[PDB]
């Protein structure tokens, strides 16, 4: 597309931070499951 000027260094898949994303999504699921939802 239009952005072609170069990219930063925070994009490999050599991460070893797979536990942090699991903690993130489990926190998100426990907050979404909670009583203080008030959606739509």
């Amino acid at each position: 597309e239009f952005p072609s000027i170069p990219l930063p260094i925070n994009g490999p898949i050599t991460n070893k931070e797979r536990s942090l994303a699991v903690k993130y999504i489990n926190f998100g699921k426990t907050v979404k499951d909670g009583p203080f939802y008030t959606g739509s």
Binding site: S4, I5, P6, L7, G11, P12, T14
Partner: protein, 123 residues
């Protein structure tokens, strides 16, 4: 201009790196830098006309016998962007030795329907 400046830059950085630290313990971490300097001493010195001796020991036969102006110009050239520069050209340390070998950013980018370049765009 333009490639012999970089060649002289590479050899004076190599001479600084071999004057400060020994060369045999640079490629690996087997008790790094001889456990650096074996609890380092009060040596804290540098070239101080020794760099021009290493220049004079190997030159191209052109008119590059510069000293006292392009000396300080290359000195500024390695501290207007770069390493240590403490108390009139002492020990030159900090991260260029592992950069010649912010670290380890292999396999960038991806070419999917997804991320990179998405960044620096105008805004």
């Amino acid at each position: 201009d333009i490639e012999f400046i970089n060649s002289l830059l590479t050899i004076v950085w190599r001479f600084i790196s071999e004057n400060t630290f020994p060369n045999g313990f640079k490629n690996f971490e087997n008790g790094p830098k001889k456990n650096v300097f074996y609890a380092p001493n009060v040596k804290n010195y540098s070239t101080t006309q020794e760099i021009l001796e290493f220049i004079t020991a190997a030159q191209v036969a052109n008119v590059e016998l510069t000293p006292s102006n392009i000396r300080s110009l290359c000195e500024v050239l390695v501290y207007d962007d770069k390493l240590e520069k403490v108390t009139h050209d002492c020990y030159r340390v900090t991260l260029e030795s592992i950069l010649q070998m912010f670290n380890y950013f292999k396999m960038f980018p991806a070419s999917k329907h997804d991320k990179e370049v998405v960044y620096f765009d105008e805004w």
